Amino acid sequence: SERIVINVGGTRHQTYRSTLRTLPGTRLAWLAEPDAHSHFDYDPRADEFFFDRHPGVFAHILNYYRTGKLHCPADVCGPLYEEELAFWGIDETDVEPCCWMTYRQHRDAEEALVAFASLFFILVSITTFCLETHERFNPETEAFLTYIEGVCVVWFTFEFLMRVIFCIDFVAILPFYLEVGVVRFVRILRIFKLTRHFVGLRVLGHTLRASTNEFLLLIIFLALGVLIFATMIYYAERIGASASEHTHFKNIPIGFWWAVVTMTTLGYGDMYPQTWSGMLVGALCALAGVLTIAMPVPVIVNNFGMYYSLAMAKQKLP
Amino acid sequence: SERIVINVGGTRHQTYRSTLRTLPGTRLAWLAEPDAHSHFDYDPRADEFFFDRHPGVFAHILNYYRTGKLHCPADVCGPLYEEELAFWGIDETDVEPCCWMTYRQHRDAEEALVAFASLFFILVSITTFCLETHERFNPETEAFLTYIEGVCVVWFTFEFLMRVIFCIDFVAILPFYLEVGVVRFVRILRIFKLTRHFVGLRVLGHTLRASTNEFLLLIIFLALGVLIFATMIYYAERIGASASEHTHFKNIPIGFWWAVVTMTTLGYGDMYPQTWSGMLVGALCALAGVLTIAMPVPVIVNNFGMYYSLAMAKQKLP
Amino acid sequence: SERIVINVGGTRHQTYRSTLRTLPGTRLAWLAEPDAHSHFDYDPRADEFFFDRHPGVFAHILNYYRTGKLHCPADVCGPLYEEELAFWGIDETDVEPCCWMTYRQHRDAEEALVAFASLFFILVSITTFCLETHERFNPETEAFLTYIEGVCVVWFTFEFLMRVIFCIDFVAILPFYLEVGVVRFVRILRIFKLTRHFVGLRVLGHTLRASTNEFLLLIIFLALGVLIFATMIYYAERIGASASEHTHFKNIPIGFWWAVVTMTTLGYGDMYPQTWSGMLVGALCALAGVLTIAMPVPVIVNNFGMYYSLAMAKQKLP
Amino acid sequence: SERIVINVGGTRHQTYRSTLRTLPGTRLAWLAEPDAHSHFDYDPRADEFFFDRHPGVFAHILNYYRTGKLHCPADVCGPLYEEELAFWGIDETDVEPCCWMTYRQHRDAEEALVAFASLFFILVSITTFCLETHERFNPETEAFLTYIEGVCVVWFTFEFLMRVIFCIDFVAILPFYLEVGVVRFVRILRIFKLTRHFVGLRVLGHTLRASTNEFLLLIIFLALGVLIFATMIYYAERIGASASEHTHFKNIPIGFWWAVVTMTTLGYGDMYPQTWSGMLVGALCALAGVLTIAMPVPVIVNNFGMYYSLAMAKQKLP
Ligand SMILES: [K+]
Ligand SMILES: [K+]
Ligand SMILES: [K+]
Ligand SMILES: [K+]
């Protein structure tokens, strides 16, 4: 029933010993015993214990011993609070689910998370790749395109004989091999090499890796919706009435196309309902797709907002 | 006019008895009278009352007795504050409407709110269900699909004779009864059986149940807009001039289709305005639909953000 | 240089008189002079002044006298701070622009801001209005529709001779007069009569009135974009080459339609670019419209979020 | 080992000198040595140092000396904390990246960031510019259009002989020069002359200049996606099978159009996939474009929200 005072950074908190012995493995629980005087900073005329720390966030630490639970203040950031919990001996996993997400956001985002003589020929190779398909240079190929191919491969050797014995490379600079030896479908990926110096694409790559669950969620939502609406639209268009000679929806498989074009509010118009039942089903499909897509995408977009703001805050400071 | 001190967790608050008497049914109101000395923790040389609670959130409780009204601090969470209101005797419905929603959101969101031998045949049944509609296996039916149905039903008994006398089951395993006797429109819903173990679909189901009013709102908005613009576009296209043989909008009913395809920014293109008045009306319809849809949808999406974040944080703590 | 202590709700603040005399018309400025001893609550053993108010929010009031400026705390709500500024004598217009909007949000949102025997015939009237346009009951008109018109007009008197001498009535029940004597374009609007009891449409009406500037903004943005892109697409499609017999864009006016259908991501497809220059212009138009629309619409949507949350928090407390 | 008390605005903080000498060039560091008594306000009966500043935000300043790092409180605004760091001698670039953006937002947004006798003829010129393109006034030109042109030019001098010798002027009023001597493609831009007094367009211009990086990001994302998906759709549509006479995608360049019309959810429908491989690729393209666009656009939209709210808070205070 005795009472003990903690003079934290000037601010005097009072409590009972009983409250301190509630979590026995921590630093505070080491003051409740009848010797703590010879183990701490003990003012023996004010009868108190001095600790040189933030007096503001201590009352949220003491609350753990007082009530039963550990929350996070909303007037300090994650790192400040975690530094204080680290000082006091509190396991940072007892944070209640109301406060865990905001408490961890910054750490979850931290997570460790001749160039012009290359870019020119990369762009050259991309363009020549694109124009061999155009039926302007296929009278049936032509030959200046093969010469420009020659030049880009003759340079790809100068910056690739610097790689393996002179030591994105084995999985993207294979066409250099296969040219004399997907043949060019891979050639575009070299654009990634020169743009890995961009602070925005690396933040993108980190976001597409910290959000693999919210991608599975979106894919499963879309698959469920597409199946449901594809099968509804078939039976809805069937009551308009052998065969189906009056409707774009001749089977359920061809309805997956319609459903995915509709749920995204794209709407080409090659497939659309033509009976009133179908029009009702399609009115439903449009809104259902809007909501289905709109639920997990904000979760994926906040991740980018956070990581981008952090990676650009770093790129502005010395 | 006498004054009283409350030493809450070290921090000394002062008031007059008069202020305390303002809410007479609470714990504080029991200190104003001349016997609390022998009913509480009373230091009779500092003349004060010790209470072993968070000293930070008390000044928002005392404010109730001081001014007239009860607000919620924005530096603590909902659960911490509600625990202390519970300690002090305050009815948590006196929270003013400025602070009520932010105070309750976490509690409103809490609300408690052989597998490989089954999934295989579920997928098998789904695909065979999709493929008898395709006019490739209808030279008019075929027979290997009928045997595939046979084997899936011969398995559906091994997981269904386990349920009702061996005791979504009656409303989704009826086709098992129905095949030998909607005939298979219901067959797809078995997909939900194996996917009720997904933490994302259960969060979805909880959000479509905590947001039944914001769905009514959206549907009513859309119906109002669709009717208004459908009747506007008819009269707008009529001044372009026995009949109207120059316009997609031959009646007002056929215009509900146009209006809903337009207000969603889908735009198939089977129906579009062709006179200048019609184009003005359609320009209005597009933006009106954008805003109409965009007002309640963010309310519905915040619910998912909250519930999903909570259910995923729970899946990460021990 | 003398110093004075203000004991607000237990918490002792210290300052110099010099700081107090900085705003001379307020309550604090009345303590600096050498007679306040007999005009307030003055402990003449602590040499201090007691005030029975929130001790936390006072340090943001004192800051005004200390530095020069008035800000709003982010750990209390608008109304609490407003009541304290009202108590201390501070003109609530001195709030710096960093804190003004967050300070006023709740007050800007407050701003004070037989049924089945009516709804039935309203719905009946709406339908019969919709189906005289359909060329199924126009072999030209028909007669059961005229009888249904008769019966709803015979009822509209029983709820309209209840209004003017027995005393949305004048500007919605003109068709009553106008039937026997726009004739029905207005007949639709009676739907609003029965839906004025809806908590969602009233919040809509309040939001469509508290955001009349953010509507002018959107309209002006769209007008500028439509004009610029309509004139750009004409000249862009003209280099594809006595007339223009190869392009949807024969003049600049007809391009306003294209531009508004494109900037909304609707895309019917009746007009699209067909030369490479046009495709570049259209690629620009799509994204420019996306961004133009997406800038003011979130401002308009937050207003609805706020007003709806308030109107539903009110409908949940007694 | 000695301890020192700082009495900031009433609130007494304690620390050791050891902590104070951690940052040796600041104001606090000037108290650690044994002469500061004669350089500050030193009560030699409580042995303490009085400073007349906000006692609340000091504990976040003192934390810098205590732990190692500088954070920003979330209960005060940017400018308040900035003024306090300025008072105490702290370099405001030591703010850790968790708190830097929230600290700077208001300053990043501050950054200093006859009318009817003109507007009439501006609108007149715009209209005239629009209708000589229309093939109703081209029997091929006409002459009342040239007379209206003449009148608006012979007014253009009364506001343009007032500007350069009586001294957006050279780069918008060159058409006046070139009329008698792009001839009018520039003629539309005069609309900006009269609308540069609009509070919304100036805020628009400020966000379009404070967000030039998030535009580069969007453009690069879109270019990457367009190239990748245009290459994929060609090869995907090729396996549907002496030429390509069955598909809209005859070469890779013409697929850039498809990809940009699809990634924006516009979907004209002049180009769409027709084989199942193509349909899979297009299903991917739609969602990929949605996400690609939706990542940086919210960053661009928050800037407008902030700058507009600030410019309207300024336009409402005296
Ligand atoms: K769209
Ligand atoms: K479309
Ligand atoms: K569309
Ligand atoms: K379309």
Side-chain angles (χ1 to χ4, degrees), chain B residues 3 15-16 19 66 71 74 214 251-252 258 262 265-268 279, chain C residues 41 43 52-53 75 77 133 135 198 201 257 265-268 301 308:
Chain B
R3 247 181 301 151
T15 349
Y16 320 95
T19 320
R66 267 165 182 166
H71 297 267
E214 308 69 81
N251 26 83
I252 310 201
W258 173 83
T262 305
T265 81
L266 175 78
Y268 289 133
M279 308 167 159
Chain C
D41 202 332
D43 318 344
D52 190 333
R53 320 276 327 187
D75 53 336
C77 56
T133 66
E135 54 255 76
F198 231 75
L201 320 194
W257 181 232
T265 81
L266 173 79
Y268 287 134
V301 157
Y308 182 65

mmCIF file of all heavy atoms in Angstrom, chain B residues 3 15-16 19 66 71 74 214 251-252 258 262 265-268 279, chain C residues 41 43 52-53 75 77 133 135 198 201 257 265-268 301 308:
data_model
loop_
_atom_site.group_PDB
_atom_site.id
_atom_site.type_symbol
_atom_site.label_atom_id
_atom_site.label_comp_id
_atom_site.label_asym_id
_atom_site.label_seq_id
_atom_site.Cartn_x
_atom_site.Cartn_y
_atom_site.Cartn_z
ATOM 1 N N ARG B 3 -12.149 25.060 -2.065
ATOM 2 C CA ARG B 3 -11.412 24.459 -3.162
ATOM 3 C C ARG B 3 -10.891 23.093 -2.744
ATOM 4 O O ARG B 3 -10.546 22.873 -1.582
ATOM 5 C CB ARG B 3 -10.253 25.351 -3.599
ATOM 6 C CG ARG B 3 -10.430 25.932 -4.989
ATOM 7 C CD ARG B 3 -9.268 26.797 -5.422
ATOM 8 N NE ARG B 3 -9.061 27.913 -4.516
ATOM 9 C CZ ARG B 3 -7.880 28.476 -4.293
ATOM 10 N NH1 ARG B 3 -6.804 28.026 -4.922
ATOM 11 N NH2 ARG B 3 -7.775 29.489 -3.442
ATOM 12 N N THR B 15 -10.021 22.470 -8.177
ATOM 13 C CA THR B 15 -11.337 22.975 -8.549
ATOM 14 C C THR B 15 -12.048 23.413 -7.287
ATOM 15 O O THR B 15 -11.488 23.354 -6.196
ATOM 16 C CB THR B 15 -12.162 21.934 -9.276
ATOM 17 O OG1 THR B 15 -11.333 20.825 -9.618
ATOM 18 C CG2 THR B 15 -12.708 22.507 -10.514
ATOM 19 N N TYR B 16 -13.281 23.885 -7.437
ATOM 20 C CA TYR B 16 -14.141 24.142 -6.294
ATOM 21 C C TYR B 16 -15.127 23.001 -6.155
ATOM 22 O O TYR B 16 -15.437 22.314 -7.127
ATOM 23 C CB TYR B 16 -14.942 25.433 -6.418
ATOM 24 C CG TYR B 16 -14.262 26.633 -7.005
ATOM 25 C CD1 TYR B 16 -14.387 26.916 -8.346
ATOM 26 C CD2 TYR B 16 -13.563 27.523 -6.208
ATOM 27 C CE1 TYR B 16 -13.798 28.015 -8.888
ATOM 28 C CE2 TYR B 16 -12.973 28.629 -6.745
ATOM 29 C CZ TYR B 16 -13.098 28.870 -8.088
ATOM 30 O OH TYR B 16 -12.514 29.973 -8.656
ATOM 31 N N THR B 19 -18.045 23.055 -8.628
ATOM 32 C CA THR B 19 -17.862 22.442 -9.930
ATOM 33 C C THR B 19 -18.120 20.951 -9.868
ATOM 34 O O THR B 19 -18.658 20.371 -10.814
ATOM 35 C CB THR B 19 -16.448 22.708 -10.432
ATOM 36 O OG1 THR B 19 -16.071 24.044 -10.109
ATOM 37 C CG2 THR B 19 -16.375 22.527 -11.911
ATOM 38 N N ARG B 66 -16.435 21.264 -15.528
ATOM 39 C CA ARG B 66 -16.062 22.667 -15.560
ATOM 40 C C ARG B 66 -16.929 23.434 -16.534
ATOM 41 O O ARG B 66 -17.539 24.441 -16.168
ATOM 42 C CB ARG B 66 -14.593 22.806 -15.923
ATOM 43 C CG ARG B 66 -13.713 22.879 -14.746
ATOM 44 C CD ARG B 66 -12.316 22.651 -15.156
ATOM 45 N NE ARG B 66 -11.446 22.668 -14.003
ATOM 46 C CZ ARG B 66 -10.203 22.238 -14.029
ATOM 47 N NH1 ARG B 66 -9.705 21.755 -15.150
ATOM 48 N NH2 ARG B 66 -9.476 22.282 -12.934
ATOM 49 N N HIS B 71 -15.942 16.056 -24.393
ATOM 50 C CA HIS B 71 -15.258 15.815 -25.651
ATOM 51 C C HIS B 71 -14.252 14.691 -25.470
ATOM 52 O O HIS B 71 -14.040 14.188 -24.368
ATOM 53 C CB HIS B 71 -14.541 17.069 -26.149
ATOM 54 C CG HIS B 71 -15.449 18.211 -26.459
ATOM 55 N ND1 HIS B 71 -15.960 18.431 -27.717
ATOM 56 C CD2 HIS B 71 -15.915 19.211 -25.680
ATOM 57 C CE1 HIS B 71 -16.717 19.511 -27.692
ATOM 58 N NE2 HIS B 71 -16.705 20.003 -26.469
ATOM 59 N N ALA B 74 -7.678 13.907 -28.683
ATOM 60 C CA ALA B 74 -7.162 13.369 -29.926
ATOM 61 C C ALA B 74 -5.737 12.857 -29.801
ATOM 62 O O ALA B 74 -5.157 12.442 -30.806
ATOM 63 C CB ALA B 74 -7.238 14.423 -31.026
ATOM 64 N N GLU B 214 -25.202 3.099 -46.506
ATOM 65 C CA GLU B 214 -24.491 3.758 -47.587
ATOM 66 C C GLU B 214 -24.650 3.033 -48.907
ATOM 67 O O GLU B 214 -24.207 3.549 -49.933
ATOM 68 C CB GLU B 214 -23.008 3.903 -47.258
ATOM 69 C CG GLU B 214 -22.689 4.539 -45.914
ATOM 70 C CD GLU B 214 -23.049 3.676 -44.724
ATOM 71 O OE1 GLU B 214 -22.266 2.768 -44.386
ATOM 72 O OE2 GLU B 214 -24.111 3.913 -44.117
ATOM 73 N N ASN B 251 -37.992 6.179 -76.599
ATOM 74 C CA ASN B 251 -38.846 6.371 -75.444
ATOM 75 C C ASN B 251 -37.973 6.733 -74.265
ATOM 76 O O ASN B 251 -36.749 6.758 -74.355
ATOM 77 C CB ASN B 251 -39.682 5.136 -75.126
ATOM 78 C CG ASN B 251 -39.061 3.868 -75.611
ATOM 79 O OD1 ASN B 251 -38.210 3.296 -74.953
ATOM 80 N ND2 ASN B 251 -39.491 3.410 -76.770
ATOM 81 N N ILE B 252 -38.621 7.024 -73.149
ATOM 82 C CA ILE B 252 -37.938 7.311 -71.898
ATOM 83 C C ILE B 252 -37.415 6.032 -71.252
ATOM 84 O O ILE B 252 -36.319 6.061 -70.685
ATOM 85 C CB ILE B 252 -38.862 8.072 -70.944
ATOM 86 C CG1 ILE B 252 -39.481 9.243 -71.678
ATOM 87 C CG2 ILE B 252 -38.099 8.540 -69.736
ATOM 88 C CD1 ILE B 252 -39.984 10.322 -70.774
ATOM 89 N N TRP B 258 -29.090 4.170 -71.238
ATOM 90 C CA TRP B 258 -28.109 5.183 -71.589
ATOM 91 C C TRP B 258 -27.614 5.912 -70.358
ATOM 92 O O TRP B 258 -26.412 6.123 -70.194
ATOM 93 C CB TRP B 258 -28.701 6.175 -72.581
ATOM 94 C CG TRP B 258 -27.794 7.318 -72.825
ATOM 95 C CD1 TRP B 258 -26.755 7.355 -73.684
ATOM 96 C CD2 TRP B 258 -27.826 8.592 -72.182
ATOM 97 N NE1 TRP B 258 -26.139 8.566 -73.629
ATOM 98 C CE2 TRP B 258 -26.783 9.344 -72.709
ATOM 99 C CE3 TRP B 258 -28.643 9.167 -71.211
ATOM 100 C CZ2 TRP B 258 -26.530 10.639 -72.301
ATOM 101 C CZ3 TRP B 258 -28.392 10.435 -70.811
ATOM 102 C CH2 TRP B 258 -27.348 11.164 -71.352
ATOM 103 N N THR B 262 -23.806 5.924 -68.909
ATOM 104 C CA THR B 262 -23.090 7.185 -68.968
ATOM 105 C C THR B 262 -22.647 7.681 -67.604
ATOM 106 O O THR B 262 -21.531 8.177 -67.470
ATOM 107 C CB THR B 262 -23.962 8.229 -69.636
ATOM 108 O OG1 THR B 262 -24.360 7.733 -70.907
ATOM 109 C CG2 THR B 262 -23.199 9.485 -69.839
ATOM 110 N N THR B 265 -19.287 6.380 -66.383
ATOM 111 C CA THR B 265 -18.157 6.571 -67.292
ATOM 112 C C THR B 265 -17.780 5.283 -67.993
ATOM 113 O O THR B 265 -16.618 5.068 -68.328
ATOM 114 C CB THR B 265 -16.928 7.151 -66.594
ATOM 115 O OG1 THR B 265 -16.223 6.105 -65.930
ATOM 116 C CG2 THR B 265 -17.314 8.208 -65.593
ATOM 117 N N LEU B 266 -18.755 4.414 -68.219
ATOM 118 C CA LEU B 266 -18.502 3.207 -68.987
ATOM 119 C C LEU B 266 -18.549 3.499 -70.481
ATOM 120 O O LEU B 266 -17.544 3.374 -71.179
ATOM 121 C CB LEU B 266 -19.515 2.139 -68.589
ATOM 122 C CG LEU B 266 -19.539 0.815 -69.325
ATOM 123 C CD1 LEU B 266 -18.431 -0.048 -68.850
ATOM 124 C CD2 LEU B 266 -20.849 0.159 -69.051
ATOM 125 N N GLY B 267 -19.690 3.931 -70.982
ATOM 126 C CA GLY B 267 -19.765 4.398 -72.344
ATOM 127 C C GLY B 267 -19.517 3.349 -73.396
ATOM 128 O O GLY B 267 -18.528 3.426 -74.117
ATOM 129 N N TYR B 268 -20.409 2.371 -73.516
ATOM 130 C CA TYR B 268 -20.304 1.416 -74.611
ATOM 131 C C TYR B 268 -20.289 2.135 -75.944
ATOM 132 O O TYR B 268 -19.369 1.965 -76.744
ATOM 133 C CB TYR B 268 -21.463 0.429 -74.577
ATOM 134 C CG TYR B 268 -21.413 -0.563 -73.464
ATOM 135 C CD1 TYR B 268 -22.517 -0.815 -72.699
ATOM 136 C CD2 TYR B 268 -20.268 -1.251 -73.187
ATOM 137 C CE1 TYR B 268 -22.476 -1.711 -71.690
ATOM 138 C CE2 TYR B 268 -20.221 -2.151 -72.179
ATOM 139 C CZ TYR B 268 -21.326 -2.378 -71.434
ATOM 140 O OH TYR B 268 -21.279 -3.288 -70.417
ATOM 141 N N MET B 279 -26.217 16.620 -76.718
ATOM 142 C CA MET B 279 -24.835 16.583 -76.270
ATOM 143 C C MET B 279 -24.642 17.425 -75.029
ATOM 144 O O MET B 279 -23.840 17.073 -74.161
ATOM 145 C CB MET B 279 -23.898 17.030 -77.379
ATOM 146 C CG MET B 279 -24.101 16.298 -78.663
ATOM 147 S SD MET B 279 -23.276 17.074 -80.029
ATOM 148 C CE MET B 279 -23.180 15.690 -81.130
ATOM 149 N N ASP C 41 -9.429 35.966 -8.182
ATOM 150 C CA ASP C 41 -9.155 35.015 -7.111
ATOM 151 C C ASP C 41 -7.648 34.975 -6.879
ATOM 152 O O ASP C 41 -6.917 34.374 -7.665
ATOM 153 C CB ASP C 41 -9.692 33.636 -7.482
ATOM 154 C CG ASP C 41 -9.922 32.751 -6.280
ATOM 155 O OD1 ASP C 41 -9.228 32.935 -5.258
ATOM 156 O OD2 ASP C 41 -10.796 31.864 -6.361
ATOM 157 N N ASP C 43 -4.586 34.137 -4.296
ATOM 158 C CA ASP C 43 -3.965 33.549 -3.119
ATOM 159 C C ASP C 43 -2.832 34.440 -2.639
ATOM 160 O O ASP C 43 -1.827 34.575 -3.353
ATOM 161 C CB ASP C 43 -3.423 32.164 -3.449
ATOM 162 C CG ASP C 43 -4.369 31.360 -4.300
ATOM 163 O OD1 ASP C 43 -5.549 31.737 -4.383
ATOM 164 O OD2 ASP C 43 -3.932 30.354 -4.893
ATOM 165 N N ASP C 52 -10.339 28.508 -13.026
ATOM 166 C CA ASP C 52 -10.871 27.148 -12.979
ATOM 167 C C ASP C 52 -11.162 26.644 -14.386
ATOM 168 O O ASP C 52 -12.294 26.371 -14.759
ATOM 169 C CB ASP C 52 -12.116 27.127 -12.114
ATOM 170 C CG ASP C 52 -12.593 25.749 -11.810
ATOM 171 O OD1 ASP C 52 -12.343 24.831 -12.602
ATOM 172 O OD2 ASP C 52 -13.254 25.588 -10.775
ATOM 173 N N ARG C 53 -10.108 26.492 -15.170
ATOM 174 C CA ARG C 53 -10.280 26.123 -16.560
ATOM 175 C C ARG C 53 -9.279 25.050 -16.928
ATOM 176 O O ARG C 53 -8.361 24.747 -16.172
ATOM 177 C CB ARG C 53 -10.121 27.331 -17.489
ATOM 178 C CG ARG C 53 -10.744 28.604 -16.983
ATOM 179 C CD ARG C 53 -12.204 28.639 -17.326
ATOM 180 N NE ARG C 53 -12.474 27.968 -18.585
ATOM 181 C CZ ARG C 53 -13.655 27.968 -19.182
ATOM 182 N NH1 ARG C 53 -14.667 28.611 -18.632
ATOM 183 N NH2 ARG C 53 -13.823 27.337 -20.328
ATOM 184 N N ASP C 75 -4.678 18.540 -30.378
ATOM 185 C CA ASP C 75 -5.120 17.488 -29.478
ATOM 186 C C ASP C 75 -6.472 17.766 -28.845
ATOM 187 O O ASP C 75 -6.959 16.931 -28.081
ATOM 188 C CB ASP C 75 -4.087 17.253 -28.376
ATOM 189 C CG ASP C 75 -3.722 18.511 -27.653
ATOM 190 O OD1 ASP C 75 -3.878 19.591 -28.242
ATOM 191 O OD2 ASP C 75 -3.272 18.424 -26.495
ATOM 192 N N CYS C 77 -10.549 19.515 -29.852
ATOM 193 C CA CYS C 77 -11.389 19.757 -31.009
ATOM 194 C C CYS C 77 -11.611 21.256 -31.177
ATOM 195 O O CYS C 77 -11.169 22.074 -30.369
ATOM 196 C CB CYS C 77 -12.711 18.998 -30.884
ATOM 197 S SG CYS C 77 -13.660 19.340 -29.402
ATOM 198 N N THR C 133 -44.746 7.513 -73.667
ATOM 199 C CA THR C 133 -43.683 7.695 -74.636
ATOM 200 C C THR C 133 -43.372 6.411 -75.381
ATOM 201 O O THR C 133 -42.953 6.463 -76.539
ATOM 202 C CB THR C 133 -42.432 8.201 -73.939
ATOM 203 O OG1 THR C 133 -41.946 7.184 -73.071
ATOM 204 C CG2 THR C 133 -42.759 9.401 -73.120
ATOM 205 N N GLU C 135 -43.643 3.382 -77.683
ATOM 206 C CA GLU C 135 -44.471 3.186 -78.863
ATOM 207 C C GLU C 135 -45.063 1.791 -78.889
ATOM 208 O O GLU C 135 -45.104 1.139 -79.934
ATOM 209 C CB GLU C 135 -43.661 3.443 -80.129
ATOM 210 C CG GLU C 135 -42.380 2.639 -80.229
ATOM 211 C CD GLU C 135 -41.146 3.481 -79.958
ATOM 212 O OE1 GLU C 135 -40.880 3.788 -78.776
ATOM 213 O OE2 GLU C 135 -40.435 3.817 -80.927
ATOM 214 N N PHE C 198 -35.587 11.873 -46.126
ATOM 215 C CA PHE C 198 -34.410 11.021 -46.179
ATOM 216 C C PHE C 198 -33.206 11.773 -45.640
ATOM 217 O O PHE C 198 -32.903 12.873 -46.100
ATOM 218 C CB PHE C 198 -34.148 10.578 -47.612
ATOM 219 C CG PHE C 198 -33.976 9.111 -47.759
ATOM 220 C CD1 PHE C 198 -35.067 8.272 -47.693
ATOM 221 C CD2 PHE C 198 -32.728 8.569 -47.960
ATOM 222 C CE1 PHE C 198 -34.917 6.924 -47.825
ATOM 223 C CE2 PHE C 198 -32.572 7.219 -48.094
ATOM 224 C CZ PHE C 198 -33.668 6.393 -48.022
ATOM 225 N N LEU C 201 -30.489 12.545 -48.588
ATOM 226 C CA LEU C 201 -30.695 13.579 -49.588
ATOM 227 C C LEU C 201 -30.615 14.972 -48.991
ATOM 228 O O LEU C 201 -30.217 15.907 -49.683
ATOM 229 C CB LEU C 201 -32.033 13.398 -50.286
ATOM 230 C CG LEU C 201 -32.485 11.990 -50.641
ATOM 231 C CD1 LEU C 201 -33.637 12.096 -51.595
ATOM 232 C CD2 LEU C 201 -31.380 11.187 -51.276
ATOM 233 N N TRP C 257 -17.651 18.120 -78.164
ATOM 234 C CA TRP C 257 -18.232 16.841 -77.797
ATOM 235 C C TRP C 257 -17.150 15.804 -77.572
ATOM 236 O O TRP C 257 -17.130 15.122 -76.542
ATOM 237 C CB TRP C 257 -19.197 16.407 -78.889
ATOM 238 C CG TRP C 257 -19.897 15.122 -78.648
ATOM 239 C CD1 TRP C 257 -19.963 14.075 -79.491
ATOM 240 C CD2 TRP C 257 -20.644 14.754 -77.491
ATOM 241 N NE1 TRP C 257 -20.696 13.073 -78.940
ATOM 242 C CE2 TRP C 257 -21.128 13.471 -77.707
ATOM 243 C CE3 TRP C 257 -20.946 15.391 -76.293
ATOM 244 C CZ2 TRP C 257 -21.895 12.806 -76.776
ATOM 245 C CZ3 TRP C 257 -21.699 14.731 -75.378
ATOM 246 C CH2 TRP C 257 -22.169 13.455 -75.620
ATOM 247 N N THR C 265 -13.064 10.119 -69.381
ATOM 248 C CA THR C 265 -12.787 8.697 -69.574
ATOM 249 C C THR C 265 -14.047 7.922 -69.903
ATOM 250 O O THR C 265 -14.167 6.748 -69.566
ATOM 251 C CB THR C 265 -12.094 8.062 -68.369
ATOM 252 O OG1 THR C 265 -13.067 7.747 -67.375
ATOM 253 C CG2 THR C 265 -11.064 8.986 -67.784
ATOM 254 N N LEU C 266 -14.997 8.568 -70.563
ATOM 255 C CA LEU C 266 -16.195 7.866 -70.992
ATOM 256 C C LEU C 266 -15.947 7.128 -72.302
ATOM 257 O O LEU C 266 -16.005 5.900 -72.353
ATOM 258 C CB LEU C 266 -17.346 8.857 -71.105
ATOM 259 C CG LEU C 266 -18.668 8.405 -71.690
ATOM 260 C CD1 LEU C 266 -19.435 7.658 -70.667
ATOM 261 C CD2 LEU C 266 -19.429 9.620 -72.099
ATOM 262 N N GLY C 267 -15.626 7.851 -73.359
ATOM 263 C CA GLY C 267 -15.198 7.221 -74.585
ATOM 264 C C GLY C 267 -16.244 6.394 -75.285
ATOM 265 O O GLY C 267 -16.098 5.181 -75.387
ATOM 266 N N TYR C 268 -17.296 7.029 -75.791
ATOM 267 C CA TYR C 268 -18.268 6.304 -76.598
ATOM 268 C C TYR C 268 -17.591 5.627 -77.772
ATOM 269 O O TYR C 268 -17.720 4.417 -77.961
ATOM 270 C CB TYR C 268 -19.350 7.250 -77.109
ATOM 271 C CG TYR C 268 -20.324 7.718 -76.076
ATOM 272 C CD1 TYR C 268 -20.676 9.037 -75.991
ATOM 273 C CD2 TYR C 268 -20.894 6.844 -75.197
ATOM 274 C CE1 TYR C 268 -21.554 9.467 -75.060
ATOM 275 C CE2 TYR C 268 -21.776 7.268 -74.263
ATOM 276 C CZ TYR C 268 -22.104 8.578 -74.200
ATOM 277 O OH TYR C 268 -22.995 9.009 -73.261
ATOM 278 N N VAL C 301 -15.996 16.165 -52.222
ATOM 279 C CA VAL C 301 -16.366 14.898 -51.602
ATOM 280 C C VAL C 301 -16.092 14.905 -50.106
ATOM 281 O O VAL C 301 -16.819 14.272 -49.328
ATOM 282 C CB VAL C 301 -15.623 13.756 -52.307
ATOM 283 C CG1 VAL C 301 -15.511 12.547 -51.412
ATOM 284 C CG2 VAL C 301 -16.322 13.400 -53.595
ATOM 285 N N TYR C 308 -22.205 14.141 -43.724
ATOM 286 C CA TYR C 308 -22.883 12.872 -43.525
ATOM 287 C C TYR C 308 -22.502 12.255 -42.196
ATOM 288 O O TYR C 308 -23.366 11.752 -41.472
ATOM 289 C CB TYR C 308 -22.554 11.917 -44.658
ATOM 290 C CG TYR C 308 -23.273 10.609 -44.537
ATOM 291 C CD1 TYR C 308 -24.644 10.547 -44.631
ATOM 292 C CD2 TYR C 308 -22.581 9.437 -44.334
ATOM 293 C CE1 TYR C 308 -25.303 9.361 -44.524
ATOM 294 C CE2 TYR C 308 -23.231 8.247 -44.225
ATOM 295 C CZ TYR C 308 -24.593 8.212 -44.320
ATOM 296 O OH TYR C 308 -25.254 7.016 -44.212
#
